[PDB]
Amino acid sequence: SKMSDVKCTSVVLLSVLQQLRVESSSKLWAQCVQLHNDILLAKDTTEAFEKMVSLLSVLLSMQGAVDINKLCEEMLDN
């Protein structure tokens, strides 16, 4: 339902973050792997929507890499 839609968006969020060569900083890849392994083992949709803000904020703090504007005006959340 809602706990299975968060558990599949955190598999696509650590693949976008693994294709951007975030594996080359082993002080931040060690936190992203702990916020993704912890969401998958969660048993409440109120304590897995707050590790999805920490994990998503890693992608929005990486500047140029992902064009957020283009990707949001691409028939998606406006």
Partner: protein, 104 residues
Amino acid sequence: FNKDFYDFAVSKGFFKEGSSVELKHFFFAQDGNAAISDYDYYRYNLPTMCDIRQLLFVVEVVDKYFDCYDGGCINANQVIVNNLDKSAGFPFNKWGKARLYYDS
């Protein structure tokens, strides 16, 4: 993530709240301290002296569960190998798979 299969399953009444069938098998990721932390589980192997008068009898009741078979040495032309395209170890995975060394 196979999103088509998940969409199809959800559109057929699956993964509802309070269901008997949930997702519990995943692909778990690991960091760079994973191989050494798994090797270090060899600290559970401690030297162990056995009871020899008891083990010398157990080993004789155990070799009776293996009496209906046959065995022996075989020549190099009777050996059966499946999937010759699998690794060949250290000092060698640098030059080929098991096929190279079974052919050379």
